[PDB]
Each structure stands twice: as C-alpha cells, then as structure tokens.
Symmetry: C2
Subunit: 141 residues, 2 copies
C-alpha cells in the first residue's frame, strides 16, 4: 500500500472513520509484537495491494485507544472491526458476536474473500454480512 | 412533541442517525400497539419535552423495516438503542448485552437519569457508559 499505517489514539481512529470514503475501513486492534497479531499483520500487509480498491487497512494499538477498546470490549487480540462510510459493518461468522472478527485468518485468500463480501454488501446498502470463511482458532480457558 | 416521530424505512433510520447532532438519539424498535411498547412509549412521550436539550426520540416500526432489527440483533421488542453523532453508544445495565435496552423503564426518572449519563459521557467523547438505574428496576427476561 505499501506500508500499514499505525494509529495510536482515539482521535486518529475517529479521523479514519470520518475520512475513509467508499472503501471498507479495516481496524486491526492489537499489539504489533503479539504473535497472533504478527501472523494477521503479515496477511494484511501481503493482501493489502490486491484489496486497495476495496479496503483501507490500519493497525490500532489497543492499549492507547481506551474509548474504542472499551466500547468494542476487546478481550482477545487481534480483534478486527470494519466500517464503511462511517457506519460500523457487522459480520456474522457463526459466533454470537457480530461486532468484531476475533482471530487471524487461515489464508490470505480467506481475508480477501471476507473483504469482497463486506465491500459488496456495503455498496448495496447492507449493514451486516455473513462471512464466507471461519476465523483461525483463539484458545481460551 | 408528545406524539414522537415515527421512522418506517431503513433510509429514514439512516437519516435520523446522521441528522441528530449533539444530542442523544433514542431509537425505540417496537410496535405501537404492543403492551410493553405502550408502557415504554408513555415514558418516552412524557419525558421527551424536558429531555429535549439532551435527546431526540424516534419510534421505529419493526413491521415496516427490518434491516436495522437484524443489525442490532433484536429478538424482543421493545428494544431501545442509543446513538451520539452517528455512533452507537453502549450502556452497561448489569446484564450481558450493552448494545440495547430491552423492555420498558420502571419509572420516568430512571429514563431521565440514564439519558443524563449517556449525554454527559458522550459529550466527553465516551462510547460506553455505566447505567445509573438500580438493577431491581431493569426488566429481566
Ligand atoms: O472480559 C472481562 C472483563 O470485561 C469487563 C469490561 O472490561 O466487563 C465485561 O465482562 C464482565 C464479566 O463477564 C461482564 O459482566 C460485563 O458486562 C462486561 O462488560 C471487566 O469488568 C471484566 O473483568
């Protein structure tokens, strides 16, 4: 894109939501050094060019964006949130929470496939889409 | 007014979310004839005027438009959703779902006190707030 932008404040996330027009805004909430975020971030970086017409991808430091981290109840990282023209786009990936996509992707193409689904739903005026793919597994207690 | 505005299509809801500036937008998803909706609509109507500096209230017909009902995962009516400057507000009532209030308020004052807290927090940039309502007064269902 080439590079992935980093956001480190509530105000920067607000500005990305407000200024990103006609593309899916992808907000990866995480920590750059977290191993699962490192895995996702590599997919994001690699796929970003092929998705540049459909999506603008930003990395967000979960620890520095309290208003958003608390609002989305980010409890496991990475957690990725989607917006389109200032509307929060929800994604049903079979789990009860449609608000954020928790975990990394199996493959780069799975991520592209999700993004296409979001984009084409949002262009049609949809606000919630079903994901054609399932997330990679996040182990819990 | 006493007779709160009705929204009967997705585009009308989209527009109220965009057009309500600097006040809490209150969206009541329900049916005007339903008994619990009648209880809640009486409180919304009777408090609307003295809340008019802090909130704009709308009645959303779930039998004429349904896009938003799926978007907010609404299974039971009434369900009431809060927004501020285009972005959804969460409220922790003491139950797991912070995205919407389900059922009717026990008293006028509970709704007033809630709007006060939502408005002040939203004006300070918050997106999630703590409900002030005593849990004994929160419908359980
Ligand atoms: O993930 C648990 C952690 O989240 C907080 C909010 O930061 O509260 C959430 O989880 C509580 C326990 O499940 C819920 O009862 C509450 O509704 C929810 O917001 C913390 O208080 C909690 O330690």
């Amino acid at each position: 894109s080439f590079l992935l932008p980093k956001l480190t404040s509530k105000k920067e996330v607000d500005q990305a939501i407000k200024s990103t027009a006609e593309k899916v805004l992808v907000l990866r909430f995480g920590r750059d050094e977290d191993p699962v975020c490192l895995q996702l971030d590599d997919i994001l970086s690699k796929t970003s060019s092929d998705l540049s017409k459909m999506a603008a991808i930003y990395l967000v430091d979960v620890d520095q964006t309290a208003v958003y981290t608390q609002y989305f109840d980010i409890s496991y990282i990475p957690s990725t949130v989607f917006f389109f023209n200032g509307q929060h786009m929800k994604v049903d990936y079979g789990s009860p929470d449609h608000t954020k996509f928790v975990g990394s992707f199996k493959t780069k193409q799975d991520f592209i496939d999700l993004i296409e689904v979001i984009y084409r739903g949002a262009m049609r005026g949809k606000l919630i889409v079903q994901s054609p793919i399932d997330p990679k597994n996040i182990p819990k207690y």
